Amino acid sequence: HTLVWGVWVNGVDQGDGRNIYIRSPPNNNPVKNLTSPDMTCNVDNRVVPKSVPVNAGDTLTFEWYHNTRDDDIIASSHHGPIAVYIAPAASNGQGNVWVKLFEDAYNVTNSTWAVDRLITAHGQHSVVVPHVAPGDYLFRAEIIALHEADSLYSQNPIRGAQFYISCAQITINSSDDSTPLPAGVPFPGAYTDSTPGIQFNIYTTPATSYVAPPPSVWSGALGGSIAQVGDASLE
Numbered sequence: 038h039t040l041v042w043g044v045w046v047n048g049v050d051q052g053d054g055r056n057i058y059i060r061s062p063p064n065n066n067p068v069k070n071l072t073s074p075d076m077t078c079n080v081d082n083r084v085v086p087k088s089v090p091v092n093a094g095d096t097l098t099f100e101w102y103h104n105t106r107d108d109d110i111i112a113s114s115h116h117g118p119i120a121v122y123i124a125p126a127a128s129n130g131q132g133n134v135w136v137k138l139f140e141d142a143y144n145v146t147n148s149t150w151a152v153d154r155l156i157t158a159h160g161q162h163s164v165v166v167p168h169v170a171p172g173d174y175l176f177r178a179e180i181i182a183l184h185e186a187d188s189l190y191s192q193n194p195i196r197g198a199q200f201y202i203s204c205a206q207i208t209i210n211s212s213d214d215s216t217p218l219p220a221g222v223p224f225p226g227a228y229t230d231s232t233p234g235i236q237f238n239i240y241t242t243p244a245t246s247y248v249a250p251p252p253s254v255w256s257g258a259l260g261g262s263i264a265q266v267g268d269a270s271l272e
């Protein structure tokens with residue numbers, strides 16, 4: 038159970054974004070129905086008033102929280118991968134428009150899942166803004182908690198993969214547009230019961246054998262990281 042408070046740009050807090058530049062749900066309940074419109078931008082997808090100004094090469098840091106800002110972020114039980122997708126605001130999330138900018142499942146070195154490191158990072162994880170057409174975008178951050186993904190939601194609606202999904206409104210001003218955004222996958226649509234990473238037993242199987250749901254990270258992605266980039270407590 039977790040939500041996005043707002044974003045930092047190049048280590049500068051853009052202030053509370055909830056229902057402002059983040060299309061926030063009314064609460065931190067998970068999305069589990071793979072075929073639902075709710076897979077797009079969660080249970081309350083609608084144009085909100087603001088869109089954060091950024092440029093290609095900026096570091097965009099999403100900040101997640103549980104109850105209060107900078108609390109315990111998400112429950113330690115919610116082991117799983119983190120992904121960021123991008124779509125043109127044009128789409129409003131509809132059609133084959135989502136391009137993956139980032140994927141992080143399990144780090145063998147430190148033996149931590151993306152979610153484990155997100156708790157350590159005070160809920161902060163980042164992507165580098167890619168060289169797409171200047172304009173308005175949604176950045177869709179997705180946490181998959183697998184603490185019950187041993188079942189499918191479609192077969193047992195009290196278990197299944199949990200999706201914590203948050204769309205930020207981002208305006209990309211300066212960009213040479215060296216990497217025009219390709220067509221992407223739909224949500225709902227790209228994740229089905231057979232798709233790998235959706236059904237997995239983290240209790241019986243080792244985390245090194247885990248394989249995140251596709252699609253693959255676009256070649257035009259300039260990567261990203263899970264790490265604190267600023268102190269929320271100094272505000």
Ligand SMILES: OC[C@H]1O[C@@H](O[C@H]2[C@H](O)[C@@H](O)[C@H](O[C@H]3[C@H](O)[C@@H](O)[C@H](O[C@H]4[C@H](O)[C@@H](O)[C@H](O)O[C@@H]4CO)O[C@@H]3CO)O[C@@H]2CO)[C@H](O)[C@@H](O)[C@@H]1O
Nearest residue numbers: 038039064065066103104111112113114115184185187240
């Ligand atoms: O731990 C392995 C075990 O996990 C079982 O699943 C547990 C989760 O581990 C546990 O973390 C989860 O806790 C939920 C709780 O069910 C929610 O009701 C609660 O929701 C709160 C919310 O946290 C508040 O932020 C908000 O203000 O109010 C709501 C209202 O209820 O949130 C917590 C997580 O923070 O409970 C699960 C029980 O299913 C698996 O079933 C089992 O297979 C695993 O072995």
Ligand SMILES: *[C@@H]1O[C@H](CO)[C@@H](O)[C@H](O)[C@H]1NC(C)=O
Nearest residue numbers: 070071072073074190191194
């Ligand atoms: C899942 O979502 C679809 C599409 O909105 C809906 O028709 C269906 O009732 C939901 N499935 C379950 C298991 O509730």
Ligand SMILES: [Cl-]
Nearest residue numbers: 038067184199
């Ligand atoms: Cl839960």
Ligand SMILES: [Cu+2]
Nearest residue numbers: 038039112115
């Ligand atoms: Cu939860």
